[PDB]
Each structure stands twice: as structure tokens, then as C-alpha cells.
Amino acid sequence: MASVLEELQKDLEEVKVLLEKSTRKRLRDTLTSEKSKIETELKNKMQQKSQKKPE
């Protein structure tokens, strides 16, 4: 869990760095794309077990 949090935080930090450096509008693209991935991975990792039916 701390693992997952750390990885998400690290990716988010890389995002912040990219946003800051790529202040030339790129921020928008970066944020939109990568935030989706961050959220997706968070949701994946949380739900992953959750007594989920083997669909």
C-alpha cells in the first residue's frame, strides 16, 4: 500500500516537474493524460483484490 502510494506520488512528482519545465502549454496535455493513468492505477490497485468475481 505504502508502495502504491509511493509510486503514485513519484509519478505525480515527475508530472509536477514536467508541468513546471514544460510551461509552454504542454502542462495541459501532460496533466490530462498522466492524471488519468495515475487515477487508473490507484483505482486498479485498490479494487484489484476486493473479493472481485473472476470475470
Curated annotation (Swiss-Prot):
Superkingdom field: Eukaryota
Subcellular localization, as worded in the UniProt entry: Nucleus; Cytoplasm
Modified residues (Phosphoserine): S3, S36
Positions carrying N-acetylalanine: A2
PTM annotation (N6-acetyllysine): residues: K10, K21
Region (Interaction with SIAH1): 2-55
Tissue specificity as recorded in UniProt: Highly expressed in brain and EAT cells. Expressed at low level in heart, muscle, and at very low level in the liver, spleen, lung, kidney and stomach.
Quaternary state and interactors: Monomer or homodimer. Component of some large E3 complex at least composed of UBE2D1, SIAH1, CACYBP/SIP, SKP1, APC and TBL1X. Interacts directly with SIAH1, SIAH2 and SKP1. Interacts with proteins of the S100 family S100A1, S100A6, S100B, S100P and S100A12 in a calcium-dependent manner.
Protein name listed in UniProt: Calcyclin-binding protein
Gene from which the chain derives: Cacybp
Stretch of the intact protein here: 1 to 55 of 229
